Amino acid sequence: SVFSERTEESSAVQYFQFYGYLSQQQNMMQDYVRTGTYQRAILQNHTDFKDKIVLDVGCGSGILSFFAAQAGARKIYAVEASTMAQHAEVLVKSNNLTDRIVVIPGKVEEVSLPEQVDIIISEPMGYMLFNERMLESYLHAKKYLKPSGNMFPTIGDVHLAPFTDEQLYMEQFTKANFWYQPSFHGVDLSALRGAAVDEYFRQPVVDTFDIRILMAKSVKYTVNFLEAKEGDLHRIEIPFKFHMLHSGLVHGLAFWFDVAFIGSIMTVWLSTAPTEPLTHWYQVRCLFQSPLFAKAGDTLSGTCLLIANKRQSYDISIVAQVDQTGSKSSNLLDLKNPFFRY
Amino acid sequence: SVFSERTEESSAVQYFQFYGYLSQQQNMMQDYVRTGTYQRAILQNHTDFKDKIVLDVGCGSGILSFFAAQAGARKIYAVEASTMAQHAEVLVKSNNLTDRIVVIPGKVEEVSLPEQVDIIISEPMGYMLFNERMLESYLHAKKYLKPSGNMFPTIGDVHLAPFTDEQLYMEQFTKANFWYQPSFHGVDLSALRGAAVDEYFRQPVVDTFDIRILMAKSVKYTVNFLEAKEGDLHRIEIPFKFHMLHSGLVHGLAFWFDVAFIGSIMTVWLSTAPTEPLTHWYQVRCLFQSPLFAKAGDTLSGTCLLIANKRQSYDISIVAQVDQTGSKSSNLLDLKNPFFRY
Ligand SMILES: N=C(N)NCCCCCN(CCCN)C[C@H]1O[C@@H](n2cnc3c(N)ncnc32)[C@H](O)[C@@H]1O
Ligand SMILES: N=C(N)NCCCCCN(CCCN)C[C@H]1O[C@@H](n2cnc3c(N)ncnc32)[C@H](O)[C@@H]1O
């Protein structure tokens, strides 16, 4: 299938084992901003669901399919590849919805549905939006979408902005500096210090922060899920030009995302911005191994390049320069091994 | 190989990726009790090393091989299957020991050594001693051991004791009772509550505790690494009869372990007992889903059965009874998915 061809079996097994736990479904359901905003998007756009056919891509416990049923959907196909599919079926029976929600075990790339659908719903967003490569399964599912069918969420906006955080930078350097020791119990570790620095600075930092660390207005990159094809997400090139509002050391770029559910009645936004209430996605920071000085009024420009790998994640390349001085930082990050600093 | 036949590829890939990070090698090296006790065991038994041939099974960064070199070993074969082997080779060159330490990339079950060795050194202990199934690779390596060669560690003792901890027990039902809601955003979750309770109680609890929670003197199960075969670890049956020193509710069994390095000059012990300073192994507790009342002077008897699985861990079965009342509890746990409560 398209899933098995893009994914190492090793990563798939670990991935679906992780989402098979009730504890993990619970952790996600308990994010009230997430769960409540999804419910509001669906119920306030009830005409997008009333008497319609729905596909729920990666239904987990089934929660979004239940929201679609509350809104009046005639039929909901709820596709789930983990062992969570069994638990979903139990809930569908106990809530007396066997006439309306049909659980289909397996990958959305591999199952068959009996008809085309009016609307696809999913929660495909990972850290930095793109982690887990679930957006590809979501877009793949458009093969089941009727012409003029909708998608919930409809669009996704990635936001980036430069930040200053000397304490964060020093924490990572202090950890890597372990490998500087010429006599760790009599052993010289120092030939590995560069490799250690590289490894620590490859880790995106998942945590929240005060907005005052941000040194310019964010730049926005938009993915339209109605129009994008799966293959568009193999290589994601995000150019940026920041106009610096404060003078200081730029220690890296901070990332967050918003999704919009563009319904017939209204548009509802789920935001993971640092100006908004906290979610279990937090925000994500990519540190530069050498920070860059910029004065207010300068321009920081470059590219964030995300390259999809077979471990259901991305190799990230970030190149940034201060245009007025030619000072450059080039960084590689490994989105599969984040540092959960919260 | 013997490794591939006993291990799902999915688990092996995750396992060796994890040990490929310098951060993880560092976390283990920074455990002073571990690193210092290994150094002391090797250096204070310098006659077991001076001019001898040594095999280091799963050398990681190479630290134990360097200790063998400090003690005078003539030749050390350092086997490592993760990408950490490359980092070890860099350290061997930078410490001018290429004439004495030979790094061999790969699994100890698949590589070739050019000669037999006098002594095998390793750190094969996981949570509850047996987690990760690395003891099997350690014993497998005895095919390279000269007759009357030594093993460092020489023996391993698993200790188990009944404990009382009402707050730990209650935390499981508090977490699972999330599912005992008739209208979580309009959805009746209650039919999954039993399954959630079962999942939480299947997790061994990795943390430490005050010794006052223990209700009887521990029972000891010993593996002699000079005599044991790999096959001995596929099924580990630990019978127990505890003579209760305190009255109360028994909520489960607590586990820890000791290893001894039995050298020609002295015996050195590395202990993870709750009476000793804390290590990164902590201790491990397996809860009973139904606790058992026992009075001081009663006998709590039964069996702990550890059954090796292909995810490099064990299925644990614990059956216990209070002999004076016939009250019974039977419990199943999955050592691959522990709860890190510290
Ligand atoms: N917090 C962080 N870090 N990230 C955010 C979590 C992102 C959503 C989690 N969950 C959403 C449940 C929403 N109700 C994804 C589910 O989608 C299933 N699934 C994944 N892929 C496929 C596929 N190709 N086919 C069929 N099912 C698939 C998984 O098994 C899993 O249950
Ligand atoms: N903290 C917690 N929780 N546990 C502690 C766990 C203790 C082990 C740490 N480390 C020892 C560090 C250096 N003394 C094990 C190494 O042995 C490698 N390795 C495993 N198996 C094999 C094999 N079959 N062949 C070849 N190499 C193998 C691993 O890649 C890993 O580097």
mmCIF file with all atom_site columns, C-alpha atoms in Angstrom, chain B residues 123-298:
data_model
loop_
_atom_site.group_PDB
_atom_site.id
_atom_site.type_symbol
_atom_site.label_atom_id
_atom_site.label_alt_id
_atom_site.label_comp_id
_atom_site.label_asym_id
_atom_site.label_entity_id
_atom_site.label_seq_id
_atom_site.pdbx_PDB_ins_code
_atom_site.Cartn_x
_atom_site.Cartn_y
_atom_site.Cartn_z
_atom_site.occupancy
_atom_site.B_iso_or_equiv
_atom_site.pdbx_formal_charge
_atom_site.auth_seq_id
_atom_site.auth_comp_id
_atom_site.auth_asym_id
_atom_site.auth_atom_id
_atom_site.pdbx_PDB_model_num
ATOM 1   C CA . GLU B 1 123 ? 26.230  -4.374  32.204 1.00 0.00 ? 123 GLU B CA 1
ATOM 2   C CA . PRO B 1 124 ? 23.279  -6.545  31.124 1.00 0.00 ? 124 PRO B CA 1
ATOM 3   C CA . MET B 1 125 ? 20.865  -5.596  33.953 1.00 0.00 ? 125 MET B CA 1
ATOM 4   C CA . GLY B 1 126 ? 17.518  -3.929  33.190 1.00 0.00 ? 126 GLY B CA 1
ATOM 5   C CA . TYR B 1 127 ? 14.538  -3.067  35.445 1.00 0.00 ? 127 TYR B CA 1
ATOM 6   C CA . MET B 1 128 ? 13.825  -5.974  37.811 1.00 0.00 ? 128 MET B CA 1
ATOM 7   C CA . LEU B 1 129 ? 17.213  -7.387  36.542 1.00 0.00 ? 129 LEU B CA 1
ATOM 8   C CA . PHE B 1 130 ? 15.695  -9.248  33.612 1.00 0.00 ? 130 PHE B CA 1
ATOM 9   C CA . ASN B 1 131 ? 14.094  -6.481  31.483 1.00 0.00 ? 131 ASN B CA 1
ATOM 10  C CA . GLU B 1 132 ? 15.578  -6.041  27.956 1.00 0.00 ? 132 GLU B CA 1
ATOM 11  C CA . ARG B 1 133 ? 16.705  -9.742  27.904 1.00 0.00 ? 133 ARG B CA 1
ATOM 12  C CA . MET B 1 134 ? 20.346  -8.652  27.670 1.00 0.00 ? 134 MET B CA 1
ATOM 13  C CA . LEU B 1 135 ? 21.319  -11.318 30.237 1.00 0.00 ? 135 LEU B CA 1
ATOM 14  C CA . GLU B 1 136 ? 20.801  -13.840 27.428 1.00 0.00 ? 136 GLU B CA 1
ATOM 15  C CA . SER B 1 137 ? 23.420  -12.125 25.174 1.00 0.00 ? 137 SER B CA 1
ATOM 16  C CA . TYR B 1 138 ? 25.775  -12.045 28.174 1.00 0.00 ? 138 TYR B CA 1
ATOM 17  C CA . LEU B 1 139 ? 25.360  -15.817 28.728 1.00 0.00 ? 139 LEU B CA 1
ATOM 18  C CA . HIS B 1 140 ? 25.465  -16.539 24.993 1.00 0.00 ? 140 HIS B CA 1
ATOM 19  C CA . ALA B 1 141 ? 28.936  -14.911 24.998 1.00 0.00 ? 141 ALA B CA 1
ATOM 20  C CA . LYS B 1 142 ? 30.273  -17.800 27.162 1.00 0.00 ? 142 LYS B CA 1
ATOM 21  C CA . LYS B 1 143 ? 30.940  -19.666 23.911 1.00 0.00 ? 143 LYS B CA 1
ATOM 22  C CA . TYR B 1 144 ? 34.024  -17.378 23.822 1.00 0.00 ? 144 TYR B CA 1
ATOM 23  C CA . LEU B 1 145 ? 35.004  -18.014 27.435 1.00 0.00 ? 145 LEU B CA 1
ATOM 24  C CA . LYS B 1 146 ? 38.057  -20.195 28.200 1.00 0.00 ? 146 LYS B CA 1
ATOM 25  C CA . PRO B 1 147 ? 37.330  -23.048 30.642 1.00 0.00 ? 147 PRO B CA 1
ATOM 26  C CA . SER B 1 148 ? 37.542  -21.565 34.147 1.00 0.00 ? 148 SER B CA 1
ATOM 27  C CA . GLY B 1 149 ? 37.156  -18.017 32.735 1.00 0.00 ? 149 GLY B CA 1
ATOM 28  C CA . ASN B 1 150 ? 35.360  -15.483 34.949 1.00 0.00 ? 150 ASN B CA 1
ATOM 29  C CA . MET B 1 151 ? 32.277  -13.246 34.487 1.00 0.00 ? 151 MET B CA 1
ATOM 30  C CA . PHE B 1 152 ? 31.873  -9.673  35.781 1.00 0.00 ? 152 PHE B CA 1
ATOM 31  C CA . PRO B 1 153 ? 29.210  -9.583  37.168 1.00 0.00 ? 153 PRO B CA 1
ATOM 32  C CA . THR B 1 154 ? 29.426  -13.140 38.467 1.00 0.00 ? 154 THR B CA 1
ATOM 33  C CA . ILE B 1 155 ? 25.983  -13.506 40.045 1.00 0.00 ? 155 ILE B CA 1
ATOM 34  C CA . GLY B 1 156 ? 22.635  -11.669 40.135 1.00 0.00 ? 156 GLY B CA 1
ATOM 35  C CA . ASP B 1 157 ? 20.082  -11.694 42.950 1.00 0.00 ? 157 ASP B CA 1
ATOM 36  C CA . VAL B 1 158 ? 16.479  -10.612 42.439 1.00 0.00 ? 158 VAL B CA 1
ATOM 37  C CA . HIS B 1 159 ? 14.713  -9.655  45.690 1.00 0.00 ? 159 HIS B CA 1
ATOM 38  C CA . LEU B 1 160 ? 10.942  -9.582  46.141 1.00 0.00 ? 160 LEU B CA 1
ATOM 39  C CA . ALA B 1 161 ? 8.896   -8.456  49.142 1.00 0.00 ? 161 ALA B CA 1
ATOM 40  C CA . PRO B 1 162 ? 5.189   -7.683  49.781 1.00 0.00 ? 162 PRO B CA 1
ATOM 41  C CA . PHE B 1 163 ? 4.334   -3.985  50.307 1.00 0.00 ? 163 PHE B CA 1
ATOM 42  C CA . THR B 1 164 ? 1.479   -1.752  51.507 1.00 0.00 ? 164 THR B CA 1
ATOM 43  C CA . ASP B 1 165 ? 0.793   1.518   49.648 1.00 0.00 ? 165 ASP B CA 1
ATOM 44  C CA . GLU B 1 166 ? -2.810  2.662   49.709 1.00 0.00 ? 166 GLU B CA 1
ATOM 45  C CA . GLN B 1 167 ? -2.151  5.925   47.786 1.00 0.00 ? 167 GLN B CA 1
ATOM 46  C CA . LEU B 1 168 ? -0.407  4.059   44.903 1.00 0.00 ? 168 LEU B CA 1
ATOM 47  C CA . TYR B 1 169 ? -3.286  1.587   44.673 1.00 0.00 ? 169 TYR B CA 1
ATOM 48  C CA . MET B 1 170 ? -5.924  4.356   44.698 1.00 0.00 ? 170 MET B CA 1
ATOM 49  C CA . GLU B 1 171 ? -4.119  6.355   41.999 1.00 0.00 ? 171 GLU B CA 1
ATOM 50  C CA . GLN B 1 172 ? -4.975  3.542   39.517 1.00 0.00 ? 172 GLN B CA 1
ATOM 51  C CA . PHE B 1 173 ? -8.702  3.758   40.086 1.00 0.00 ? 173 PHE B CA 1
ATOM 52  C CA . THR B 1 174 ? -8.634  7.534   40.083 1.00 0.00 ? 174 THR B CA 1
ATOM 53  C CA . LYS B 1 175 ? -6.982  7.459   36.643 1.00 0.00 ? 175 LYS B CA 1
ATOM 54  C CA . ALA B 1 176 ? -9.270  4.772   35.229 1.00 0.00 ? 176 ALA B CA 1
ATOM 55  C CA . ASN B 1 177 ? -12.411 6.438   36.582 1.00 0.00 ? 177 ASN B CA 1
ATOM 56  C CA . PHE B 1 178 ? -11.997 8.960   33.812 1.00 0.00 ? 178 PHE B CA 1
ATOM 57  C CA . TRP B 1 179 ? -13.878 6.364   31.729 1.00 0.00 ? 179 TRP B CA 1
ATOM 58  C CA . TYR B 1 180 ? -16.776 6.102   34.313 1.00 0.00 ? 180 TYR B CA 1
ATOM 59  C CA . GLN B 1 181 ? -18.622 9.150   32.995 1.00 0.00 ? 181 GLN B CA 1
ATOM 60  C CA . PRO B 1 182 ? -22.063 8.775   31.308 1.00 0.00 ? 182 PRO B CA 1
ATOM 61  C CA . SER B 1 183 ? -21.656 12.023  29.334 1.00 0.00 ? 183 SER B CA 1
ATOM 62  C CA . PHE B 1 184 ? -18.058 13.024  28.524 1.00 0.00 ? 184 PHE B CA 1
ATOM 63  C CA . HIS B 1 185 ? -18.973 15.675  25.930 1.00 0.00 ? 185 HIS B CA 1
ATOM 64  C CA . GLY B 1 186 ? -22.228 13.749  25.477 1.00 0.00 ? 186 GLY B CA 1
ATOM 65  C CA . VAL B 1 187 ? -20.606 10.301  25.226 1.00 0.00 ? 187 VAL B CA 1
ATOM 66  C CA . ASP B 1 188 ? -21.067 7.425   27.636 1.00 0.00 ? 188 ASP B CA 1
ATOM 67  C CA . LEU B 1 189 ? -17.548 6.101   28.282 1.00 0.00 ? 189 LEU B CA 1
ATOM 68  C CA . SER B 1 190 ? -18.396 3.697   31.110 1.00 0.00 ? 190 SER B CA 1
ATOM 69  C CA . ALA B 1 191 ? -18.212 0.461   29.205 1.00 0.00 ? 191 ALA B CA 1
ATOM 70  C CA . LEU B 1 192 ? -14.392 0.936   28.814 1.00 0.00 ? 192 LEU B CA 1
ATOM 71  C CA . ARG B 1 193 ? -13.711 1.471   32.543 1.00 0.00 ? 193 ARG B CA 1
ATOM 72  C CA . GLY B 1 194 ? -12.947 -2.177  33.282 1.00 0.00 ? 194 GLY B CA 1
ATOM 73  C CA . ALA B 1 195 ? -10.548 -2.394  30.357 1.00 0.00 ? 195 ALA B CA 1
ATOM 74  C CA . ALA B 1 196 ? -8.803  0.789   31.557 1.00 0.00 ? 196 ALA B CA 1
ATOM 75  C CA . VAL B 1 197 ? -8.404  -0.559  35.125 1.00 0.00 ? 197 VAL B CA 1
ATOM 76  C CA . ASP B 1 198 ? -6.850  -3.749  33.667 1.00 0.00 ? 198 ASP B CA 1
ATOM 77  C CA . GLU B 1 199 ? -4.435  -1.730  31.516 1.00 0.00 ? 199 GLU B CA 1
ATOM 78  C CA . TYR B 1 200 ? -3.257  0.449   34.429 1.00 0.00 ? 200 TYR B CA 1
ATOM 79  C CA . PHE B 1 201 ? -2.736  -2.570  36.739 1.00 0.00 ? 201 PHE B CA 1
ATOM 80  C CA . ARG B 1 202 ? -0.747  -4.362  33.989 1.00 0.00 ? 202 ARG B CA 1
ATOM 81  C CA . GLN B 1 203 ? 1.995   -1.682  34.309 1.00 0.00 ? 203 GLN B CA 1
ATOM 82  C CA . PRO B 1 204 ? 4.874   -2.280  36.711 1.00 0.00 ? 204 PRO B CA 1
ATOM 83  C CA . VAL B 1 205 ? 5.625   0.878   38.659 1.00 0.00 ? 205 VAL B CA 1
ATOM 84  C CA . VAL B 1 206 ? 9.211   2.139   38.445 1.00 0.00 ? 206 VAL B CA 1
ATOM 85  C CA . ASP B 1 207 ? 9.967   4.526   41.300 1.00 0.00 ? 207 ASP B CA 1
ATOM 86  C CA . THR B 1 208 ? 11.478  4.456   44.763 1.00 0.00 ? 208 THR B CA 1
ATOM 87  C CA . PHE B 1 209 ? 9.855   4.239   48.174 1.00 0.00 ? 209 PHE B CA 1
ATOM 88  C CA . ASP B 1 210 ? 10.428  4.399   51.917 1.00 0.00 ? 210 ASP B CA 1
ATOM 89  C CA . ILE B 1 211 ? 11.375  0.933   53.301 1.00 0.00 ? 211 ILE B CA 1
ATOM 90  C CA . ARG B 1 212 ? 8.607   1.147   55.932 1.00 0.00 ? 212 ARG B CA 1
ATOM 91  C CA . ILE B 1 213 ? 6.068   0.078   53.268 1.00 0.00 ? 213 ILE B CA 1
ATOM 92  C CA . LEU B 1 214 ? 7.632   -3.424  53.227 1.00 0.00 ? 214 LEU B CA 1
ATOM 93  C CA . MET B 1 215 ? 5.721   -6.058  55.185 1.00 0.00 ? 215 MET B CA 1
ATOM 94  C CA . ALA B 1 216 ? 8.157   -9.016  55.305 1.00 0.00 ? 216 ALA B CA 1
ATOM 95  C CA . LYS B 1 217 ? 11.772  -9.909  54.786 1.00 0.00 ? 217 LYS B CA 1
ATOM 96  C CA . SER B 1 218 ? 12.582  -10.308 51.069 1.00 0.00 ? 218 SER B CA 1
ATOM 97  C CA . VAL B 1 219 ? 12.862  -13.605 49.230 1.00 0.00 ? 219 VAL B CA 1
ATOM 98  C CA . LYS B 1 220 ? 16.007  -13.949 47.024 1.00 0.00 ? 220 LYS B CA 1
ATOM 99  C CA . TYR B 1 221 ? 16.228  -15.659 43.588 1.00 0.00 ? 221 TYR B CA 1
ATOM 100 C CA . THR B 1 222 ? 19.814  -16.099 42.326 1.00 0.00 ? 222 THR B CA 1
ATOM 101 C CA . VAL B 1 223 ? 21.208  -16.493 38.835 1.00 0.00 ? 223 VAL B CA 1
ATOM 102 C CA . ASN B 1 224 ? 24.796  -17.719 38.752 1.00 0.00 ? 224 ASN B CA 1
ATOM 103 C CA . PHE B 1 225 ? 26.228  -16.405 35.444 1.00 0.00 ? 225 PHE B CA 1
ATOM 104 C CA . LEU B 1 226 ? 29.108  -18.922 35.471 1.00 0.00 ? 226 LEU B CA 1
ATOM 105 C CA . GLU B 1 227 ? 26.577  -21.820 35.354 1.00 0.00 ? 227 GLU B CA 1
ATOM 106 C CA . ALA B 1 228 ? 23.389  -20.492 33.740 1.00 0.00 ? 228 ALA B CA 1
ATOM 107 C CA . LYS B 1 229 ? 22.518  -21.137 30.092 1.00 0.00 ? 229 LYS B CA 1
ATOM 108 C CA . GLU B 1 230 ? 20.517  -18.669 27.948 1.00 0.00 ? 230 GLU B CA 1
ATOM 109 C CA . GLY B 1 231 ? 17.571  -21.021 28.000 1.00 0.00 ? 231 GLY B CA 1
ATOM 110 C CA . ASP B 1 232 ? 17.339  -20.739 31.783 1.00 0.00 ? 232 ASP B CA 1
ATOM 111 C CA . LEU B 1 233 ? 16.014  -17.186 31.334 1.00 0.00 ? 233 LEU B CA 1
ATOM 112 C CA . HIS B 1 234 ? 13.084  -17.983 28.992 1.00 0.00 ? 234 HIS B CA 1
ATOM 113 C CA . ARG B 1 235 ? 10.956  -19.075 31.981 1.00 0.00 ? 235 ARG B CA 1
ATOM 114 C CA . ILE B 1 236 ? 11.816  -17.932 35.486 1.00 0.00 ? 236 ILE B CA 1
ATOM 115 C CA . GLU B 1 237 ? 9.763   -19.450 38.301 1.00 0.00 ? 237 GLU B CA 1
ATOM 116 C CA . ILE B 1 238 ? 10.173  -17.760 41.701 1.00 0.00 ? 238 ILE B CA 1
ATOM 117 C CA . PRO B 1 239 ? 8.196   -19.463 44.477 1.00 0.00 ? 239 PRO B CA 1
ATOM 118 C CA . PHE B 1 240 ? 7.703   -17.448 47.686 1.00 0.00 ? 240 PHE B CA 1
ATOM 119 C CA . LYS B 1 241 ? 6.592   -17.869 51.279 1.00 0.00 ? 241 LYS B CA 1
ATOM 120 C CA . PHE B 1 242 ? 6.609   -14.558 53.197 1.00 0.00 ? 242 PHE B CA 1
ATOM 121 C CA . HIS B 1 243 ? 6.342   -14.554 56.984 1.00 0.00 ? 243 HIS B CA 1
ATOM 122 C CA . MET B 1 244 ? 4.442   -11.303 57.594 1.00 0.00 ? 244 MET B CA 1
ATOM 123 C CA . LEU B 1 245 ? 6.157   -8.871  60.043 1.00 0.00 ? 245 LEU B CA 1
ATOM 124 C CA . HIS B 1 246 ? 3.396   -6.203  59.953 1.00 0.00 ? 246 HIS B CA 1
ATOM 125 C CA . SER B 1 247 ? -0.387  -6.376  59.685 1.00 0.00 ? 247 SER B CA 1
ATOM 126 C CA . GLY B 1 248 ? -2.211  -4.593  56.864 1.00 0.00 ? 248 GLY B CA 1
ATOM 127 C CA . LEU B 1 249 ? -3.387  -4.686  53.267 1.00 0.00 ? 249 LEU B CA 1
ATOM 128 C CA . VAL B 1 250 ? -0.805  -6.146  50.854 1.00 0.00 ? 250 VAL B CA 1
ATOM 129 C CA . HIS B 1 251 ? -1.111  -4.131  47.658 1.00 0.00 ? 251 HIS B CA 1
ATOM 130 C CA . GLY B 1 252 ? 1.628   -6.013  45.709 1.00 0.00 ? 252 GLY B CA 1
ATOM 131 C CA . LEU B 1 253 ? 5.242   -7.150  45.413 1.00 0.00 ? 253 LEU B CA 1
ATOM 132 C CA . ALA B 1 254 ? 8.280   -4.861  45.236 1.00 0.00 ? 254 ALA B CA 1
ATOM 133 C CA . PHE B 1 255 ? 11.363  -5.968  43.283 1.00 0.00 ? 255 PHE B CA 1
ATOM 134 C CA . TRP B 1 256 ? 15.001  -4.956  43.307 1.00 0.00 ? 256 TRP B CA 1
ATOM 135 C CA . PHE B 1 257 ? 18.344  -6.596  42.481 1.00 0.00 ? 257 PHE B CA 1
ATOM 136 C CA . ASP B 1 258 ? 22.002  -6.975  43.469 1.00 0.00 ? 258 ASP B CA 1
ATOM 137 C CA . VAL B 1 259 ? 24.950  -8.169  41.381 1.00 0.00 ? 259 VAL B CA 1
ATOM 138 C CA . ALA B 1 260 ? 28.283  -9.386  42.722 1.00 0.00 ? 260 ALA B CA 1
ATOM 139 C CA . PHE B 1 261 ? 31.662  -9.212  41.019 1.00 0.00 ? 261 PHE B CA 1
ATOM 140 C CA . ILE B 1 262 ? 33.458  -12.226 42.560 1.00 0.00 ? 262 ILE B CA 1
ATOM 141 C CA . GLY B 1 263 ? 37.158  -11.537 41.847 1.00 0.00 ? 263 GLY B CA 1
ATOM 142 C CA . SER B 1 264 ? 40.397  -13.157 43.055 1.00 0.00 ? 264 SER B CA 1
ATOM 143 C CA . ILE B 1 265 ? 41.208  -10.262 45.446 1.00 0.00 ? 265 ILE B CA 1
ATOM 144 C CA . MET B 1 266 ? 37.687  -9.293  46.564 1.00 0.00 ? 266 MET B CA 1
ATOM 145 C CA . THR B 1 267 ? 33.964  -9.437  46.018 1.00 0.00 ? 267 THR B CA 1
ATOM 146 C CA . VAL B 1 268 ? 32.303  -6.127  45.096 1.00 0.00 ? 268 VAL B CA 1
ATOM 147 C CA . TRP B 1 269 ? 28.525  -5.637  45.240 1.00 0.00 ? 269 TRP B CA 1
ATOM 148 C CA . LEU B 1 270 ? 26.325  -3.269  43.226 1.00 0.00 ? 270 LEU B CA 1
ATOM 149 C CA . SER B 1 271 ? 22.938  -3.076  44.992 1.00 0.00 ? 271 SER B CA 1
ATOM 150 C CA . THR B 1 272 ? 19.674  -1.413  43.872 1.00 0.00 ? 272 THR B CA 1
ATOM 151 C CA . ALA B 1 273 ? 17.895  -2.087  47.183 1.00 0.00 ? 273 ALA B CA 1
ATOM 152 C CA . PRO B 1 274 ? 15.636  0.610   48.739 1.00 0.00 ? 274 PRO B CA 1
ATOM 153 C CA . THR B 1 275 ? 18.042  0.684   51.740 1.00 0.00 ? 275 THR B CA 1
ATOM 154 C CA . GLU B 1 276 ? 20.886  1.831   49.447 1.00 0.00 ? 276 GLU B CA 1
ATOM 155 C CA . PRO B 1 277 ? 21.512  5.041   47.511 1.00 0.00 ? 277 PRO B CA 1
ATOM 156 C CA . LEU B 1 278 ? 19.316  5.527   44.482 1.00 0.00 ? 278 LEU B CA 1
ATOM 157 C CA . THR B 1 279 ? 20.372  4.373   40.956 1.00 0.00 ? 279 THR B CA 1
ATOM 158 C CA . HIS B 1 280 ? 18.682  4.856   37.603 1.00 0.00 ? 280 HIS B CA 1
ATOM 159 C CA . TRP B 1 281 ? 17.154  1.342   37.994 1.00 0.00 ? 281 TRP B CA 1
ATOM 160 C CA . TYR B 1 282 ? 15.120  2.632   40.973 1.00 0.00 ? 282 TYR B CA 1
ATOM 161 C CA . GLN B 1 283 ? 12.907  -0.204  42.241 1.00 0.00 ? 283 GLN B CA 1
ATOM 162 C CA . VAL B 1 284 ? 9.874   -1.870  40.666 1.00 0.00 ? 284 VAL B CA 1
ATOM 163 C CA . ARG B 1 285 ? 6.396   -2.604  42.095 1.00 0.00 ? 285 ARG B CA 1
ATOM 164 C CA . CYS B 1 286 ? 3.752   -4.877  40.668 1.00 0.00 ? 286 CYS B CA 1
ATOM 165 C CA . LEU B 1 287 ? 0.264   -4.184  42.084 1.00 0.00 ? 287 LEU B CA 1
ATOM 166 C CA . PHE B 1 288 ? -2.416  -6.732  42.862 1.00 0.00 ? 288 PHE B CA 1
ATOM 167 C CA . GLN B 1 289 ? -5.831  -5.763  41.399 1.00 0.00 ? 289 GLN B CA 1
ATOM 168 C CA . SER B 1 290 ? -7.328  -7.160  44.607 1.00 0.00 ? 290 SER B CA 1
ATOM 169 C CA . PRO B 1 291 ? -5.313  -6.472  47.730 1.00 0.00 ? 291 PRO B CA 1
ATOM 170 C CA . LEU B 1 292 ? -4.944  -9.087  50.471 1.00 0.00 ? 292 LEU B CA 1
ATOM 171 C CA . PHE B 1 293 ? -5.324  -8.620  54.235 1.00 0.00 ? 293 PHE B CA 1
ATOM 172 C CA . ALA B 1 294 ? -2.683  -10.290 56.345 1.00 0.00 ? 294 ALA B CA 1
ATOM 173 C CA . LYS B 1 295 ? -1.876  -10.092 60.033 1.00 0.00 ? 295 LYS B CA 1
ATOM 174 C CA . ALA B 1 296 ? 1.619   -10.195 61.439 1.00 0.00 ? 296 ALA B CA 1
ATOM 175 C CA . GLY B 1 297 ? 2.588   -13.895 61.784 1.00 0.00 ? 297 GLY B CA 1
ATOM 176 C CA . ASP B 1 298 ? 0.546   -15.038 58.746 1.00 0.00 ? 298 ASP B CA 1
#
